């Protein structure tokens, strides 16, 4: 599709101008409660 | 130095850039605490002319008071 080739060209342009590290891992959270992380005492 | 430019820019408090910065900073300071420590002066030229030096032992605290 024309949208498919346009998306491929846009992805190539994005890789050329910004690099390949486009994605970042995000932790999944099964609870909505944030706890203070336990640190060295 | 840059602080001359910062002084002449701080004189123009009704310009678009200064009003935008004051608006976003007012929003931030209103959602912060009433008294809280600032890591650095947000007006370095004013702090420097009032006596602040980037030396250990100089502390900046930001505070809001009801007018």
């Amino acid at each position: 599709s024309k949208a498919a080739k346009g998306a491929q060209a846009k992805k190539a342009a994005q890789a050329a101008l910004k690099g390949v590290h486009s994605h970042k891992k995000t932790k999944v959270r099964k609870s909505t409660t944030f706890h203070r992380p336990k640190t060295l005492v | 130095g840059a602080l001359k430019y910062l002084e002449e820019l701080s004189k123009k408090k009704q310009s678009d850039v200064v009003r935008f910065l004051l608006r976003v900073r007012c929003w931030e300071y209103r959602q912060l605490n009433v008294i809280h420590r600032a890591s650095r002066p947000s007006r370095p030229d004013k702090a420097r002319r009032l006596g602040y030096k980037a030396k250990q032992g100089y502390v900046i605290y930001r505070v809001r008071v009801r007018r």
Binding site: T26, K27, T32 | G1, Y5, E28
Partner: protein, 235 residues
């Protein structure tokens, strides 16, 4: 062969029937106040209309040109403590033997850093190239610097990373760096970098630096606006 004693118990997670499974609730986590404040601060800076003098810092150098600039600038890092100590010992030896320090030490060529120093060099028209970090807080320290460079006729470029400039200048953070002059074997590289900056950054941001930034609406607000416009077009 599988043991026939095994059986399957599928669970249907509809309303009223068995308990819902543990799903990713990261979109709905009650975040701490500082995380919420910084995310809302970034969101507000996108939502509000940004004046051009601040919005010009959104357009930065791309990866290739920033890499070439750092390849040139990494040859001119400032003197370290051990190198300065060795140079001082050699100069003290020359003084003891009855020679000036200029006889044993050569003329240095380094990058120039420190905001007051770089602004003075720009005003004296000594700096050949200026690189300004895109994320200086407060922004008033560098908001005039593109205009000053344009008036002085200095090639300037906004680059990502005050920490990246600090890695050059052996600090945690540098707001702005500059080159006044280089060595003879790097004069061609400096001129090529200056020309590449001129036709690849400044000509592209010549128009976009005058435009107001921000004004982006939210995801839900954009969806509501699209639905309203579609309903108005249909009716």
């Amino acid at each position: 062969p599988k043991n026939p004693l095994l059986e399957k118990r599928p669970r249907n997670f509809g309303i009223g029937q068995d308990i819902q499974p543990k799903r990713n609730l990261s979109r709905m986590v009650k975040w701490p106040e500082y995380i919420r404040l910084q995310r809302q601060k970034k969101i507000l800076r996108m939502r509000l209309k940004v004046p051009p003098a601040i919005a010009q810092f959104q357009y930065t150098l791309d990866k290739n040109l920033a890499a070439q600039a750092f390849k040139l600038l990494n040859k001119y890092r400032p003197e370290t403590k051990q190198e300065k100590k060795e140079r001082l010992l050699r100069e003290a030896t020359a003084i003891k033997e009855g020679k000036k320090k200029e006889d044993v030490s050569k003329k240095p060529y380094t990058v120039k850093y420190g905001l007051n120093h770089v602004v003075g060099l720009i005003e004296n028209k000594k700096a050949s190239l200026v690189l300004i970090a895109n994320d200086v807080d407060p922004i008033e320290l560098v908001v005039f610097l593109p205009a000053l460079c344009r008036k002085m006729g200095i090639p300037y470029a906004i680059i990502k990373g005050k920490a990246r400039l600090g890695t050059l200048v052996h600090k945690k953070t540098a707001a702005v760096v500059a080159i006044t002059e280089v060595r003879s074997e790097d004069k061609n590289e400096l001129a090529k970098l200056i020309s590449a900056v001129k036709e690849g950054y400044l000509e592209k941001v010549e128009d976009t630096r005058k435009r107001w930034g921000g004004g982006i609406m939210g995801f839900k607000a954009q969806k509501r606006e699209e639905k309203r416009k579609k309903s108005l077009e249909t009716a």
